[PDB]
Amino acid sequence: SLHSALMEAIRSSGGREKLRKV
Amino acid sequence: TTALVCDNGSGLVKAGFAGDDAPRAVFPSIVGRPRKDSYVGDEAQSKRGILTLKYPIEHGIITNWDDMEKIWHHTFYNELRVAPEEHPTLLTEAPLNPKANREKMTQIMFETFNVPAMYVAIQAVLSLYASGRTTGIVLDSGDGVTHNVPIYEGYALPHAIMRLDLAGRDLTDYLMKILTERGYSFVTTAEREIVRDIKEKLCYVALDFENEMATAASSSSLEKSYELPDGQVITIGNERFRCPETLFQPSFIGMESAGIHETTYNSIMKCDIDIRKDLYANNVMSGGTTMYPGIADRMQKEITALAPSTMKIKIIAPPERKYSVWIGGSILASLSTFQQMWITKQEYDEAGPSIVHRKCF
Ligand SMILES: Nc1ncnc2c1ncn2[C@@H]1O[C@H](COP(=O)(O)OP(=O)(O)OP(=O)(O)O)[C@@H](O)[C@H]1O
Ligand SMILES: [Ca+2]
Ligand SMILES: [Ca+2]
């Protein structure tokens, strides 16, 4: 499921560090 | 091919680039005309004295599409300095945004701004994502509207969304009211801006209203001074917490509506019994009107009184609550797994504006 892969990414991708400081 | 993230609110626009940790531009959602021929955003505000202002987004909903187009054009070209045809654009919308409104946003982005791809996300959901969650109930209180949005695994549950037509603008107006009882007269548009600063700096949510009023009546320990722009210094007391108390008791401004603690409980109680514990344990605050010191503790107390005794109640109040919607959009739009979910220009051309319902939910 495509939605669950996105949800799993939102919970455990680590995106929030990965955001560039600006 | 860098995506843009535009969070359009009743009071403030937050715009920037997906992958950034902060919006590049934050400016009032206003179009001013002389009292050139129109000014948008930060022009129109610093130049306010010679302008009449219109707000294209009211109570969380776009009500003036011509001026909303100006806000978007000003966001693309003046603030972010990009050509929208070169960038996928993530837009935000209020919960329970009418179908015709979402289609009109979609048609404008594709036919007027010619974006290559776009997406419309519910603001409360992006705030939940910014907190590292995909399940929870969000209290989103902004300038024009307040919502309780239960969300299960990325899906907002529209049947259980609650709406309270009371937010920061009304609290500013109410504080203008009650400051007059102390003998201070704040009337003008410039004086409204001062009272909004008073609210944002000095107001808080009392843990128990009657105890706090008795404390305020018998001492000056809750009084705080505030320097006006002309140097004069005023002192405010129980108005500090009487102003945000309206969120919990809307009848203070004559609204026949339940306060945000009861609407939270009722929204949970409209969800499937199966998911309620997860909602109670994941109460996420978002929006500028949830910034008051003490609001989390009061919500914890009030919901504990309503919920079963064994339930675990946690209120999450992140420090970047004013910007959680935008941050959540920046995260979402920059995810590798998200890219198949953009509405492309070809999909729009083959389905019409009703593609937004199919793809955004
Ligand atoms: N520290 C604070 N304390 C209390 N209120 C605040 C604080 N900071 C901002 N606000 C209020 O938050 C409101 C703006 O918040 P936000 O940017 O989330 O609203 P919006 O997105 O423009 O509106 P909406 O979501 O209702 O369409 C303003 O009314 C402002 O006065
Ligand atoms: Ca908002
Ligand atoms: Ca005007």
Specify the DSSP class assigned to residue A19: S
- For residues B3 and B102, state if they share a domain: yes
Q: What is the largest CA-CA distance in chain A?
A: 34
| Shared-domain flag, residues B155 and B300 | yes
Q: Do A20 and B153 touch (CB under 8 A)?
A: no
Chain A neighbors of B153, CB-CB under 8 A: 3-4, 7
Provide the b/e sequence for B253-290 (b: ≥16 CB within 10 Å). eeeebbbbbbbbbebbeebeeebbebbbbbbbbbbbbb
| CATH code of B32's domain | 2.30.36.70
CA atoms within 13 A of residue B234's CA, in its CB half-sphere: 18
Chain A residues with CB under 8 Å of B24 CB are: 22
Query: Within this chain, do residues B163 and B265 fall inside the same structural domain, yes or no?
Result: yes
- Residue B103 near residue B19 (C-beta atoms within 8 A): no
Query: Tokens standing for B12?
Result: 């403030």
Whether residue B211 is found in the same domain as residue B232? yes
| A21 DSSP assignment | P
Residue B303, CB-side half-sphere exposure with 13 Å CA sphere: 28
Q: Residues of B with CB below 8 A from A5's CB?
A: 337
b/e per residue, B126-138, with b = 16+ CB within 10 A?
Answer: bbbbbbbbbbbbb
Same domain, B144 and B286: yes
User: How many angstroms separate the most distant Cα atoms in chain B?
Assistant: 69
User: Which protein residues have a CB closer than 5 Å to ligand 3 (ion)?
Assistant: B 33, 52, 54
- B20 contacts in chain A (CB < 8 Å): 19-20, 22
- The CATH number of whichever domain residue B92 belongs to comes to 3.30.420.40
Question: What is the SS3 assignment for A13?
Answer: coil
Alpha-carbon radius of gyration of chain A: 10
**A21 to chain B: nearest residue by CA?**
B21
**Minimum-distance CB partner of B330 among A4, A7, A19:** A19
Q: How was this structure determined?
A: X-ray
Among partner residues B20, B154, B336, which is closest to A19 by beta-carbon distance?
B20
Q: Residue B255: give the domain boundaries.
A: 172-260
What's the resolution in A? 2.3
Shared domain for B12 and B99, answered yes or no, is yes
CB pairs under 8 A between A and B: 59
DSSP 8-class letter at A1: -
User: Are the beta carbons of A6 and B154 closer than 8 angstroms?
Assistant: yes
Q: For residue B177, what is the domain's CATH number?
A: 3.90.640.10
Of the bound ligands, which one is closest to the alpha carbon of residue B48?
Answer: 3
Answer whether B136's CB lies under 8 Å from A10's CB.
no
Among B18, B37, B58, identify where a domain stops.
B58
Residue B270 identity: K
| Cα B305–chain centre separation | 27
Q: At B205, phi and psi to the nearest 5? A: -100, 120
| B340 → chain A, closest CA residue | A2
Say if ligand 1 is within 6 A of residue B244 CB.
no
Token pair listed for B213: 């009023």
The CA distance from B114 to B348, in Å, is 11
Do B266 and B348 sit in the same domain of this protein? no
Name the pairing type of β-strands B283-286 and B136-141.
Answer: parallel
Strands (E), A1-22: none
Residues B291 and B159 in one domain: yes
Residues B270 and B156 in one domain: yes
Among B125, B144, B145, residue whose Cα is nearest residue B135? B125
Q: Are residues B237 and B306 in the same domain?
A: no
Enumerate the β-bridge partners of residue B344: B117
A11 CB near a chain B CB, below 8 Å?
Answer: yes
Indicate which residue's Cα is closest to atom 25 of ligand 1: B142
State which amino acid sits at residue B199: K
Contacts 24+ apart (CB under 8 A), B211-218: B212/B238, B212/B241, B213/B238, B213/B242
Candidate from B21, B133, B337 with C-beta closest to A19:
B21
Q: Measured between CA atoms, how close is B284 to chain A, in angstroms?
A: 15
Q: A14 by DSSP, 3-state: which?
A: coil
Ligand 1 contact via B60 beta carbon (within 6 Å): yes
Q: Cβ A19–B327 below 8 Å, yes or no?
A: yes
Q: Please tell me whether residues B232 and B84 are part of one structural domain.
A: no
In angstroms, the CA B204 to CA B212 distance is 11
Task: Report the C-alpha gap between B211 and B215 in whole angstroms.
Answer: 6
Ligand 1 site-directed mutation target among B13, B91, B143, most atoms within 8 Å of CB: B143
Q: How far is B282 from chain A (nearest CA, A)?
A: 14
Q: Which of B260, B276, B298 is the last residue of a domain?
A: B260
Give me the number of domains chain B comprises: 4
Q: Is B39:B31 a contact under the CB 8 Å cutoff?
A: yes
Which two tokens mark B59? 């109570």
CB contact at 8 A, B243 and B174:
yes
In three-state form (DSSP H/G/I as H, E/B as E, the rest C), the secondary structure along chain B is CCCEEEEECCCEEEEEECCECCCCEEEECCEEEECCCCEECHHHHHCHHHEEEECCEECCEECCHHHHHHHHHHHHHHHHCCCHHHCCEEEEECCCCCHHHHHHHHHHHHHHCCCCEEEEEEHHHHHHHHCCCCCEEEEEECCCCEEEEEEECCEECHHHCEEECCCHHHHHHHHHHHHHHCCCCCCCHHHHHHHHHHHHHHCCCCCCHHHHHHHHHHCCCCCEEEECCCCCEEEECCHHHHHHHHHHCHHHHCCCCCCHHHHHHHHHHCCCHHHHHHHHCCEEEECHHHCCCCHHHHHHHHHHHHCCCCCCCCEECCCCCCCHHHHHHHHHHCCHHHHHHCEEHHHHHHHCCCHHHHHCC
Cα separations in angstroms, B142 against B2, B30, B147, B324, B325: 28, 16, 9, 12, 11
Do residue A11 and residue B133 have CB atoms under 8 angstroms apart? yes
Same domain assignment for residues B34 and B19: no
Last residue of a domain, one of B236, B260, B284: B260
What does chain A come to in residues?
A: 22
Distance between Cα B190 and ligand 2 center (Å)? 23
* Cβ-based burial of B213 (10 A; exposed 0-12, middle 13-18, buried ≥19): middle
User: Where does residue B42 fall: left (phi above 0), alpha (psi -120 to 50 degrees), or beta otherwise?
Assistant: alpha
Of B279, B274, B273, the closest CA to residue B303 belongs to B279
Residue A6 host element (H or E): helix A2-12
